[PDB]
Amino acid sequence: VESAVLRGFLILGKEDRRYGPALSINELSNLAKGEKANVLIGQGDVVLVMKRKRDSSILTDSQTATKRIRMAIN
Amino acid sequence: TSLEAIVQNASSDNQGIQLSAVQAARKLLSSDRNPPIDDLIKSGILPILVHCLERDDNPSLQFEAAWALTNIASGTSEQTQAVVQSNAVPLFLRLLHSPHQNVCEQAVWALGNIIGDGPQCRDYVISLGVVKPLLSFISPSIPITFLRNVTWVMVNLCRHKDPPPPMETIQEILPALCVLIHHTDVNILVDTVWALSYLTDAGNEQIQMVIDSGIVPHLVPLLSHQEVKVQTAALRAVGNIVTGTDEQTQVVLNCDALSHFPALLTHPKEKINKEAVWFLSNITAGNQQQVQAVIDANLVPMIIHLLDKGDFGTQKEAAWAISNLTISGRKDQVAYLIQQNVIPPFCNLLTVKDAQVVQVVLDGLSNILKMAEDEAETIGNLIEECGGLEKIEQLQNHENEDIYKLAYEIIDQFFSS
Protein backbone atom coordinates (compact mmCIF):
# COMPACT_ATOMS: atom_id res chain seq x y z
CA VAL A 1 0.00 0.00 0.00
CA GLU A 2 2.61 2.50 1.12
CA SER A 3 5.10 1.53 -1.57
CA ALA A 4 2.36 1.86 -4.18
CA VAL A 5 1.90 5.48 -3.23
CA LEU A 6 5.63 5.92 -3.56
CA ARG A 7 5.48 4.57 -7.09
CA GLY A 8 4.08 7.99 -7.97
CA PHE A 9 7.15 9.71 -6.58
CA LEU A 10 10.81 10.07 -7.45
CA ILE A 11 13.18 9.71 -4.51
CA LEU A 12 15.68 12.51 -5.05
CA GLY A 13 17.98 12.10 -2.07
CA LYS A 14 18.50 13.18 1.52
CA GLU A 15 16.07 15.26 3.52
CA ASP A 16 16.09 18.91 2.57
CA ARG A 17 14.20 20.82 5.22
CA ARG A 18 13.81 23.70 2.80
CA TYR A 19 10.83 21.62 1.71
CA GLY A 20 9.29 21.50 5.13
CA PRO A 21 8.94 18.92 7.89
CA ALA A 22 8.72 15.27 6.86
CA LEU A 23 5.35 14.11 5.61
CA SER A 24 3.51 10.84 6.00
CA ILE A 25 3.17 8.51 3.05
CA ASN A 26 -0.57 9.24 3.17
CA GLU A 27 -0.04 12.99 3.20
CA LEU A 28 2.15 12.55 0.11
CA SER A 29 -0.93 12.26 -2.11
CA ASN A 30 -1.83 15.89 -1.29
CA LEU A 31 1.00 17.38 -3.32
CA ALA A 32 0.73 19.45 -6.44
CA LYS A 33 2.20 18.48 -9.75
CA GLY A 34 5.98 18.27 -9.70
CA GLU A 35 6.02 19.23 -6.04
CA LYS A 36 8.97 18.24 -3.86
CA ALA A 37 8.52 17.12 -0.28
CA ASN A 38 10.38 15.31 2.47
CA VAL A 39 8.65 12.09 3.47
CA LEU A 40 9.08 9.43 6.15
CA ILE A 41 9.50 6.03 4.48
CA GLY A 42 10.55 4.02 7.52
CA GLN A 43 11.87 4.32 11.06
CA GLY A 44 14.45 7.10 10.95
CA ASP A 45 14.03 7.23 7.18
CA VAL A 46 13.44 10.71 5.75
CA VAL A 47 14.10 11.43 2.08
CA LEU A 48 13.30 14.11 -0.48
CA VAL A 49 10.89 13.03 -3.18
CA MET A 50 9.40 14.60 -6.29
CA LYS A 51 5.96 13.92 -7.68
CA ARG A 52 6.13 11.97 -10.94
CA LYS A 53 3.10 13.69 -12.41
CA ARG A 54 4.85 16.93 -13.25
CA ASP A 55 4.44 20.61 -13.88
CA SER A 56 4.80 22.40 -17.22
CA SER A 57 7.48 24.76 -18.53
CA ILE A 58 6.86 28.49 -18.29
CA LEU A 59 5.34 29.96 -21.42
CA THR A 60 6.72 33.12 -23.00
CA ASP A 61 6.06 33.28 -26.74
CA SER A 62 2.96 31.11 -26.43
CA GLN A 63 -0.30 33.06 -26.19
CA THR A 64 -0.42 35.36 -23.17
CA ALA A 65 -1.81 38.90 -23.49
CA THR A 66 -2.41 39.83 -19.86
CA LYS A 67 -2.75 43.52 -20.69
CA ARG A 68 -3.80 45.05 -23.99
CA ILE A 69 -3.67 48.64 -25.13
CA ARG A 70 -6.20 50.02 -27.60
CA MET A 71 -4.34 51.67 -30.47
CA ALA A 72 -7.36 52.80 -32.43
CA ILE A 73 -11.03 52.21 -33.16
CA ASN A 74 -10.51 49.49 -35.81
CA THR B 1 -1.54 72.45 -27.63
CA SER B 2 0.20 71.20 -24.50
CA LEU B 3 -0.52 68.60 -21.82
CA GLU B 4 -1.10 71.22 -19.15
CA ALA B 5 -3.66 72.87 -21.41
CA ILE B 6 -5.42 69.56 -21.96
CA VAL B 7 -5.91 68.95 -18.25
CA GLN B 8 -7.28 72.48 -17.90
CA ASN B 9 -9.91 72.24 -20.64
CA ALA B 10 -10.79 68.84 -19.18
CA SER B 11 -11.97 70.59 -16.03
CA SER B 12 -14.31 72.91 -17.93
CA ASP B 13 -17.94 72.92 -16.87
CA ASN B 14 -18.79 72.98 -20.54
CA GLN B 15 -19.03 69.51 -22.05
CA GLY B 16 -18.01 70.13 -25.66
CA ILE B 17 -14.74 71.65 -24.51
CA GLN B 18 -14.27 68.88 -21.96
CA LEU B 19 -14.93 66.06 -24.48
CA SER B 20 -12.50 67.55 -26.96
CA ALA B 21 -9.86 67.70 -24.24
CA VAL B 22 -10.45 64.14 -23.09
CA GLN B 23 -10.20 63.09 -26.72
CA ALA B 24 -6.86 64.85 -26.86
CA ALA B 25 -5.71 62.94 -23.79
CA ARG B 26 -6.74 59.70 -25.42
CA LYS B 27 -4.79 60.58 -28.57
CA LEU B 28 -1.60 61.16 -26.59
CA LEU B 29 -2.22 57.75 -25.08
CA SER B 30 -2.54 55.89 -28.38
CA SER B 31 0.22 57.42 -30.56
CA ASP B 32 2.75 54.60 -30.13
CA ARG B 33 3.73 51.59 -28.03
CA ASN B 34 5.35 53.75 -25.36
CA PRO B 35 2.81 56.51 -24.55
CA PRO B 36 3.60 59.36 -22.09
CA ILE B 37 1.62 57.51 -19.41
CA ASP B 38 3.66 58.53 -16.37
CA ASP B 39 3.37 62.13 -17.48
CA LEU B 40 -0.38 61.79 -17.94
CA ILE B 41 -0.69 60.29 -14.46
CA LYS B 42 1.29 63.20 -13.06
CA SER B 43 -0.84 65.82 -14.81
CA GLY B 44 -3.79 65.19 -12.50
CA ILE B 45 -5.99 64.05 -15.38
CA LEU B 46 -6.91 60.77 -13.65
CA PRO B 47 -9.58 62.09 -11.29
CA ILE B 48 -11.09 64.10 -14.12
CA LEU B 49 -11.20 61.09 -16.42
CA VAL B 50 -12.73 58.97 -13.69
CA HIS B 51 -15.52 61.49 -13.06
CA CYS B 52 -16.35 61.49 -16.76
CA LEU B 53 -17.47 57.90 -16.45
CA GLU B 54 -20.36 59.22 -14.40
CA ARG B 55 -21.74 61.21 -17.32
CA ASP B 56 -24.62 59.06 -18.53
CA ASP B 57 -25.77 62.00 -20.64
CA ASN B 58 -22.71 61.70 -22.82
CA PRO B 59 -21.71 58.22 -24.05
CA SER B 60 -19.01 59.76 -26.28
CA LEU B 61 -17.36 61.24 -23.23
CA GLN B 62 -17.80 58.08 -21.17
CA PHE B 63 -16.25 56.10 -23.99
CA GLU B 64 -13.34 58.46 -24.59
CA ALA B 65 -12.54 58.73 -20.92
CA ALA B 66 -12.75 54.98 -20.52
CA TRP B 67 -10.43 54.58 -23.51
CA ALA B 68 -7.83 56.94 -22.02
CA LEU B 69 -8.02 55.10 -18.70
CA THR B 70 -7.75 51.72 -20.40
CA ASN B 71 -4.45 52.69 -21.98
CA ILE B 72 -3.05 53.97 -18.74
CA ALA B 73 -3.93 50.64 -17.17
CA SER B 74 -2.32 48.66 -20.02
CA GLY B 75 1.03 49.72 -18.61
CA THR B 76 3.08 48.60 -15.64
CA SER B 77 1.61 47.46 -12.35
CA GLU B 78 2.29 50.85 -10.81
CA GLN B 79 0.47 52.51 -13.73
CA THR B 80 -2.49 50.16 -13.57
CA GLN B 81 -2.56 50.75 -9.82
CA ALA B 82 -2.78 54.49 -10.37
CA VAL B 83 -5.97 53.89 -12.26
CA VAL B 84 -7.55 51.72 -9.61
CA GLN B 85 -6.37 54.05 -6.84
CA SER B 86 -8.43 56.79 -8.51
CA ASN B 87 -11.50 54.70 -7.70
CA ALA B 88 -12.20 53.90 -11.34
CA VAL B 89 -13.08 50.23 -10.90
CA PRO B 90 -16.59 50.61 -9.40
CA LEU B 91 -17.48 52.96 -12.23
CA PHE B 92 -16.35 50.52 -14.86
CA LEU B 93 -18.58 47.95 -13.22
CA ARG B 94 -21.43 50.44 -13.40
CA LEU B 95 -20.76 50.93 -17.10
CA LEU B 96 -21.22 47.22 -17.72
CA HIS B 97 -24.92 47.91 -17.31
CA SER B 98 -24.78 50.79 -19.79
CA PRO B 99 -27.32 50.48 -22.59
CA HIS B 100 -24.63 51.55 -25.06
CA GLN B 101 -22.37 48.90 -26.54
CA ASN B 102 -19.37 51.17 -27.08
CA VAL B 103 -19.27 52.14 -23.39
CA CYS B 104 -19.83 48.57 -22.24
CA GLU B 105 -17.01 47.36 -24.38
CA GLN B 106 -14.49 49.90 -23.24
CA ALA B 107 -15.40 49.20 -19.65
CA VAL B 108 -14.84 45.49 -20.28
CA TRP B 109 -11.44 46.20 -21.82
CA ALA B 110 -10.27 48.47 -19.03
CA LEU B 111 -11.37 45.93 -16.44
CA GLY B 112 -9.41 43.25 -18.25
CA ASN B 113 -6.18 45.17 -17.86
CA ILE B 114 -6.91 45.72 -14.17
CA ILE B 115 -7.84 42.08 -13.60
CA GLY B 116 -4.69 40.98 -15.39
CA ASP B 117 -2.44 42.89 -13.04
CA GLY B 118 -2.54 40.22 -10.42
CA PRO B 119 -4.56 37.91 -8.19
CA GLN B 120 -5.41 40.61 -5.65
CA CYS B 121 -6.86 42.81 -8.40
CA ARG B 122 -8.54 39.81 -9.91
CA ASP B 123 -10.18 38.94 -6.58
CA TYR B 124 -11.29 42.49 -5.97
CA VAL B 125 -12.94 43.00 -9.36
CA ILE B 126 -14.54 39.58 -8.92
CA SER B 127 -15.86 40.30 -5.42
CA LEU B 128 -17.65 43.36 -6.75
CA GLY B 129 -19.41 40.99 -9.13
CA VAL B 130 -17.86 41.40 -12.58
CA VAL B 131 -18.27 37.87 -13.88
CA LYS B 132 -22.04 37.64 -14.28
CA PRO B 133 -22.39 41.00 -16.15
CA LEU B 134 -19.40 40.06 -18.34
CA LEU B 135 -20.74 36.64 -19.34
CA SER B 136 -24.14 38.10 -20.02
CA PHE B 137 -22.75 39.90 -23.06
CA ILE B 138 -22.17 36.50 -24.68
CA SER B 139 -24.94 36.14 -27.22
CA PRO B 140 -25.10 35.38 -30.89
CA SER B 141 -25.91 38.99 -31.70
CA ILE B 142 -22.70 40.25 -30.12
CA PRO B 143 -20.05 41.63 -32.50
CA ILE B 144 -17.06 39.30 -32.82
CA THR B 145 -14.64 42.04 -31.82
CA PHE B 146 -16.66 42.53 -28.63
CA LEU B 147 -16.80 38.81 -27.96
CA ARG B 148 -13.03 38.55 -28.36
CA ASN B 149 -12.59 41.08 -25.59
CA VAL B 150 -15.00 39.30 -23.28
CA THR B 151 -13.17 35.99 -23.76
CA TRP B 152 -9.84 37.70 -23.13
CA VAL B 153 -11.04 39.08 -19.81
CA MET B 154 -12.39 35.61 -19.10
CA VAL B 155 -8.83 34.30 -19.38
CA ASN B 156 -7.48 36.92 -17.00
CA LEU B 157 -10.18 35.93 -14.55
CA CYS B 158 -8.92 32.34 -14.63
CA ARG B 159 -5.23 33.16 -14.45
CA HIS B 160 -3.10 32.91 -11.23
CA LYS B 161 -3.24 29.81 -9.03
CA ASP B 162 -2.01 31.15 -5.73
CA PRO B 163 -4.66 32.07 -4.81
CA PRO B 164 -6.76 30.36 -7.50
CA PRO B 165 -10.03 31.84 -8.64
CA PRO B 166 -12.91 31.33 -6.22
CA MET B 167 -15.43 28.54 -6.57
CA GLU B 168 -18.20 30.86 -7.64
CA THR B 169 -16.14 32.34 -10.47
CA ILE B 170 -15.13 28.96 -11.90
CA GLN B 171 -18.67 27.62 -11.69
CA GLU B 172 -19.83 30.70 -13.60
CA ILE B 173 -17.12 30.62 -16.20
CA LEU B 174 -17.16 26.91 -17.07
CA PRO B 175 -20.62 26.83 -18.61
CA ALA B 176 -19.70 29.89 -20.70
CA LEU B 177 -16.63 27.97 -21.89
CA CYS B 178 -18.83 25.05 -22.92
CA VAL B 179 -20.55 27.47 -25.23
CA LEU B 180 -17.49 29.22 -26.64
CA ILE B 181 -15.46 26.09 -27.33
CA HIS B 182 -17.84 25.56 -30.25
CA HIS B 183 -17.06 28.91 -31.84
CA THR B 184 -15.41 28.95 -35.28
CA ASP B 185 -13.45 32.14 -34.62
CA VAL B 186 -9.83 31.28 -33.95
CA ASN B 187 -9.04 34.06 -31.47
CA ILE B 188 -12.03 33.12 -29.36
CA LEU B 189 -11.26 29.44 -29.54
CA VAL B 190 -7.70 30.05 -28.42
CA ASP B 191 -8.82 32.09 -25.42
CA THR B 192 -11.54 29.61 -24.46
CA VAL B 193 -8.91 26.89 -24.41
CA TRP B 194 -6.33 29.02 -22.52
CA ALA B 195 -8.97 29.83 -19.94
CA LEU B 196 -9.31 26.06 -19.54
CA SER B 197 -5.55 25.81 -19.17
CA TYR B 198 -5.47 28.01 -16.14
CA LEU B 199 -8.55 26.43 -14.67
CA THR B 200 -6.96 22.98 -14.93
CA ASP B 201 -3.73 24.40 -13.56
CA ALA B 202 -5.09 25.20 -10.12
CA GLY B 203 -5.03 21.53 -9.34
CA ASN B 204 -6.98 18.33 -8.97
CA GLU B 205 -10.10 19.87 -7.46
CA GLN B 206 -10.48 22.31 -10.32
CA ILE B 207 -9.68 19.58 -12.85
CA GLN B 208 -12.71 17.69 -11.50
CA MET B 209 -14.79 20.77 -12.17
CA VAL B 210 -13.57 20.89 -15.76
CA ILE B 211 -14.19 17.17 -16.11
CA ASP B 212 -17.65 17.32 -14.50
CA SER B 213 -18.80 20.04 -16.91
CA GLY B 214 -18.70 17.71 -19.90
CA ILE B 215 -16.27 19.87 -21.84
CA VAL B 216 -13.41 17.39 -22.22
CA PRO B 217 -14.85 15.33 -25.14
CA HIS B 218 -14.96 18.67 -26.96
CA LEU B 219 -11.47 19.71 -25.83
CA VAL B 220 -9.39 16.63 -26.72
CA PRO B 221 -10.24 16.90 -30.43
CA LEU B 222 -8.51 20.30 -30.55
CA LEU B 223 -5.19 18.54 -30.30
CA SER B 224 -5.67 18.11 -34.06
CA HIS B 225 -7.04 21.56 -34.85
CA GLN B 226 -5.66 23.03 -38.05
CA GLU B 227 -4.54 26.02 -36.06
CA VAL B 228 -1.32 25.51 -34.16
CA LYS B 229 -2.24 28.16 -31.58
CA VAL B 230 -5.30 26.14 -30.71
CA GLN B 231 -3.32 22.89 -30.47
CA THR B 232 -0.63 24.38 -28.23
CA ALA B 233 -3.24 25.51 -25.73
CA ALA B 234 -5.26 22.34 -25.91
CA LEU B 235 -2.11 20.40 -25.27
CA ARG B 236 -1.51 22.46 -22.16
CA ALA B 237 -5.09 22.13 -21.01
CA VAL B 238 -5.46 18.39 -21.51
CA GLY B 239 -1.91 17.97 -20.26
CA ASN B 240 -2.81 19.59 -16.97
CA ILE B 241 -5.71 17.19 -16.55
CA VAL B 242 -3.51 14.11 -16.89
CA THR B 243 -1.35 15.33 -14.03
CA GLY B 244 -4.49 14.56 -12.04
CA THR B 245 -5.49 11.27 -10.45
CA ASP B 246 -5.56 8.06 -12.48
CA GLU B 247 -9.33 8.24 -12.80
CA GLN B 248 -9.08 11.82 -14.04
CA THR B 249 -6.37 10.83 -16.52
CA GLN B 250 -8.59 8.06 -17.79
CA VAL B 251 -11.34 10.48 -18.67
CA VAL B 252 -9.02 12.04 -21.19
CA LEU B 253 -7.66 8.77 -22.61
CA ASN B 254 -11.22 7.60 -23.10
CA CYS B 255 -11.74 10.52 -25.47
CA ASP B 256 -9.07 8.89 -27.62
CA ALA B 257 -6.36 11.34 -26.69
CA LEU B 258 -3.44 9.18 -27.73
CA SER B 259 -4.57 8.95 -31.34
CA HIS B 260 -3.64 12.60 -31.67
CA PHE B 261 -0.04 12.19 -30.63
CA PRO B 262 1.83 10.82 -33.67
CA ALA B 263 1.35 14.19 -35.33
CA LEU B 264 2.71 16.01 -32.30
CA LEU B 265 5.66 13.74 -31.69
CA THR B 266 6.76 14.24 -35.30
CA HIS B 267 5.76 17.89 -35.49
CA PRO B 268 8.24 20.31 -37.05
CA LYS B 269 8.19 22.53 -33.96
CA GLU B 270 10.31 21.27 -31.09
CA LYS B 271 8.13 23.10 -28.59
CA ILE B 272 5.22 20.90 -29.64
CA ASN B 273 7.48 17.86 -29.47
CA LYS B 274 8.48 18.74 -25.89
CA GLU B 275 4.91 19.28 -24.68
CA ALA B 276 3.76 16.09 -26.31
CA VAL B 277 6.28 13.93 -24.50
CA TRP B 278 5.66 15.88 -21.29
CA PHE B 279 2.04 14.85 -21.64
CA LEU B 280 3.00 11.25 -22.36
CA SER B 281 5.43 11.21 -19.43
CA ASN B 282 2.44 11.99 -17.22
CA ILE B 283 0.65 9.02 -18.70
CA THR B 284 3.49 6.59 -18.03
CA ALA B 285 3.22 7.80 -14.46
CA GLY B 286 -0.28 6.34 -14.43
CA ASN B 287 -1.40 2.79 -13.82
CA GLN B 288 -0.48 -0.26 -15.84
CA GLN B 289 -3.56 -0.08 -18.00
CA GLN B 290 -2.42 3.43 -18.92
CA VAL B 291 1.17 2.41 -19.63
CA GLN B 292 -0.32 -0.31 -21.82
CA ALA B 293 -2.37 2.26 -23.68
CA VAL B 294 0.72 4.24 -24.64
CA ILE B 295 2.38 1.10 -25.90
CA ASP B 296 -0.69 -0.07 -27.82
CA ALA B 297 -0.94 3.34 -29.43
CA ASN B 298 2.51 2.71 -30.97
CA LEU B 299 3.97 5.76 -29.30
CA VAL B 300 7.01 4.35 -27.54
CA PRO B 301 9.33 4.23 -30.57
CA MET B 302 8.64 7.91 -31.32
CA ILE B 303 9.42 8.63 -27.72
CA ILE B 304 12.68 6.73 -27.84
CA HIS B 305 13.43 8.53 -31.06
CA LEU B 306 12.93 11.97 -29.61
CA LEU B 307 14.84 10.71 -26.59
CA ASP B 308 17.71 10.06 -28.99
CA LYS B 309 17.58 12.86 -31.57
CA GLY B 310 15.47 15.55 -29.94
CA ASP B 311 16.51 18.89 -28.53
CA PHE B 312 17.44 18.87 -24.89
CA GLY B 313 14.00 19.96 -23.74
CA THR B 314 12.23 17.12 -25.43
CA GLN B 315 14.93 14.73 -24.22
CA LYS B 316 14.36 15.83 -20.64
CA GLU B 317 10.66 15.10 -20.98
CA ALA B 318 11.45 11.87 -22.81
CA ALA B 319 13.71 10.56 -20.03
CA TRP B 320 10.95 11.15 -17.44
CA ALA B 321 8.51 9.24 -19.62
CA ILE B 322 10.93 6.34 -19.80
CA SER B 323 11.77 6.50 -16.10
CA ASN B 324 8.13 6.81 -15.09
CA LEU B 325 7.27 3.74 -17.17
CA THR B 326 10.16 1.96 -15.56
CA ILE B 327 8.43 2.03 -12.19
CA SER B 328 4.77 2.13 -13.27
CA GLY B 329 4.93 -0.84 -15.60
CA ARG B 330 4.77 -4.62 -15.49
CA LYS B 331 7.75 -6.81 -16.19
CA ASP B 332 6.75 -7.37 -19.80
CA GLN B 333 5.96 -3.72 -20.25
CA VAL B 334 9.55 -2.98 -19.38
CA ALA B 335 10.69 -5.92 -21.51
CA TYR B 336 9.02 -4.23 -24.46
CA LEU B 337 10.87 -1.04 -23.63
CA ILE B 338 14.17 -2.92 -23.87
CA GLN B 339 13.38 -4.75 -27.09
CA GLN B 340 12.46 -1.35 -28.51
CA ASN B 341 16.08 -0.42 -27.92
CA VAL B 342 15.66 2.07 -25.09
CA ILE B 343 18.93 1.23 -23.37
CA PRO B 344 21.36 3.13 -25.57
CA PRO B 345 19.57 6.49 -26.05
CA PHE B 346 18.63 6.43 -22.35
CA CYS B 347 22.24 5.92 -21.24
CA ASN B 348 23.60 8.68 -23.44
CA LEU B 349 21.75 11.24 -21.35
CA LEU B 350 23.98 10.54 -18.37
CA THR B 351 26.43 13.10 -19.69
CA VAL B 352 24.16 16.14 -19.67
CA LYS B 353 24.62 18.98 -17.16
CA ASP B 354 21.03 19.02 -15.88
CA ALA B 355 21.44 17.00 -12.69
CA GLN B 356 17.77 16.14 -12.38
CA VAL B 357 17.64 14.37 -15.71
CA VAL B 358 20.71 12.37 -14.72
CA GLN B 359 19.05 11.15 -11.51
CA VAL B 360 15.99 10.38 -13.59
CA VAL B 361 17.94 8.22 -15.99
CA LEU B 362 19.85 6.59 -13.14
CA ASP B 363 16.53 5.88 -11.43
CA GLY B 364 15.30 4.31 -14.66
CA LEU B 365 18.30 2.02 -15.09
CA SER B 366 17.99 0.94 -11.49
CA ASN B 367 14.35 -0.02 -11.80
CA ILE B 368 15.05 -1.90 -15.01
CA LEU B 369 17.84 -3.86 -13.35
CA LYS B 370 15.97 -4.66 -10.15
CA MET B 371 13.01 -5.69 -12.22
CA ALA B 372 14.52 -7.94 -14.87
CA GLU B 373 15.82 -10.71 -12.65
CA ASP B 374 17.32 -13.50 -14.77
CA GLU B 375 18.12 -10.72 -17.19
CA ALA B 376 20.15 -8.55 -14.83
CA GLU B 377 23.35 -9.66 -16.54
CA THR B 378 21.62 -9.66 -19.89
CA ILE B 379 20.63 -6.03 -19.34
CA GLY B 380 23.86 -5.24 -17.54
CA ASN B 381 25.51 -6.24 -20.81
CA LEU B 382 23.26 -3.90 -22.81
CA ILE B 383 24.14 -1.01 -20.51
CA GLU B 384 27.82 -1.75 -20.76
CA GLU B 385 27.99 -2.21 -24.53
CA CYS B 386 26.47 1.17 -25.43
CA GLY B 387 28.95 2.78 -23.06
CA GLY B 388 26.44 3.35 -20.30
CA LEU B 389 28.48 1.65 -17.60
CA GLU B 390 31.37 3.94 -18.46
CA LYS B 391 29.03 6.89 -17.99
CA ILE B 392 27.60 5.55 -14.76
CA GLU B 393 31.12 4.74 -13.50
CA GLN B 394 32.25 8.35 -13.58
CA LEU B 395 29.05 9.74 -12.12
CA GLN B 396 30.66 8.48 -8.97
CA ASN B 397 31.95 11.94 -8.17
CA HIS B 398 31.03 14.17 -5.25
CA GLU B 399 29.73 17.26 -7.04
CA ASN B 400 26.29 15.73 -6.50
CA GLU B 401 26.11 13.31 -3.62
CA ASP B 402 22.69 12.10 -4.60
CA ILE B 403 23.82 11.18 -8.05
CA TYR B 404 26.97 9.72 -6.55
CA LYS B 405 25.17 7.39 -4.18
CA LEU B 406 22.87 6.10 -6.89
CA ALA B 407 25.76 5.50 -9.27
CA TYR B 408 27.52 3.54 -6.54
CA GLU B 409 24.65 1.22 -5.71
CA ILE B 410 23.94 0.32 -9.30
CA ILE B 411 27.59 -0.55 -9.80
CA ASP B 412 27.77 -2.39 -6.47
CA GLN B 413 24.65 -4.47 -7.02
CA PHE B 414 24.86 -5.14 -10.76
CA PHE B 415 28.39 -4.57 -12.13
CA SER B 416 30.83 -6.01 -9.64
CA SER B 417 31.96 -9.29 -11.19
From Swiss-Prot, chain A:
The UniProt entry annotates the motif Nuclear localization signal at: 51-54
State its location(s).
Virion; Host nucleus; Host mitochondrion
Instruction: Note the superkingdom of the native organism.
Output: Viruses
Subunit notes for this chain?
Answer: Influenza RNA polymerase is composed of three subunits: PB1, PB2 and PA. Interacts (via N-terminus) with PB1 (via C-terminus). Interacts with nucleoprotein NP (via N-terminus). Interacts (via N-terminus) with host MAVS (via N-terminus); this interaction inhibits host innate immune response.
Q: Which family does it belong to?
A: Belongs to the influenza viruses PB2 family.
| Function field | Plays an essential role in transcription initiation and cap-stealing mechanism, in which cellular capped pre-mRNAs are used to generate primers for viral transcription. Recognizes and binds the 7-methylguanosine-containing cap of the target pre-RNA which is subsequently cleaved after 10-13 nucleotides by the viral protein PA. Plays a role in the initiation of the viral genome replication and modulates the activity of the ribonucleoprotein (RNP) complex.
What name is this protein filed under? Polymerase basic protein 2
Q: Which organism is it from?
A: Influenza A virus (strain A/Victoria/3/1975 H3N2)
- State the covered range within the intact protein: 686 to 759 of 759
Swiss-Prot record, chain B:
Instruction: Tell me where the ARM repeats sit in this chain.
Output: 1-36, 37-79, 80-124, 125-163, 164-208, 209-248, 249-290, 291-330, 331-373, 377-415
Residue ranges of region NLS binding site (minor)? Answer: 236-324
Question: Where, per UniProt, does this protein localize?
Answer: Cytoplasm; Nucleus
Principal localization? cytoplasm
User: What keywords are annotated for this sequence in UniProt?
Assistant: Acetylation, Cytoplasm, Host-virus interaction, Nucleus, Phosphoprotein, Protein transport, Repeat, Transport
Could you provide one GO biological process annotation from this protein's UniProt record?
A: NLS-bearing protein import into nucleus
Q: In which tissues is it expressed?
A: Highly expressed in testis, ovary, small intestine, heart, skeletal muscle, lung and pancreas, but barely detectable in kidney, thymus, colon and peripheral blood leukocytes.
Named from the GO MF annotations, one term is: nuclear localization sequence binding
Query: What are the boundaries of the region NLS binding site (major)?
Result: 67-159
Q: Can you cite an annotated GO cellular component?
A: cytoplasm
Q: What does this protein do?
A: Functions in nuclear protein import as an adapter protein for nuclear receptor KPNB1. Binds specifically and directly to substrates containing either a simple or bipartite NLS motif. Docking of the importin/substrate complex to the nuclear pore complex (NPC) is mediated by KPNB1 through binding to nucleoporin FxFG repeats and the complex is subsequently translocated through the pore by an energy requiring, Ran-dependent mechanism.
Q: Give the multimer and partner information.
A: Forms a complex with importin subunit beta-1 (KPNB1). Interacts with SNAI1. Interacts with TALDO1 isoform 1. Interacts with CYB1.
The record comments on the domains as follows: Consists of an N-terminal hydrophilic region, a hydrophobic central region composed of 10 repeats, and a short hydrophilic C-terminus. The N-terminal hydrophilic region contains the importin beta binding domain (IBB domain), which is sufficient for binding importin beta and essential for nuclear protein import.
Q: Which family does the record assign?
A: Belongs to the importin alpha family.
Instruction: Specify the protein name.
Output: Importin subunit alpha-3
Tell me what organism the protein belongs to: Homo sapiens
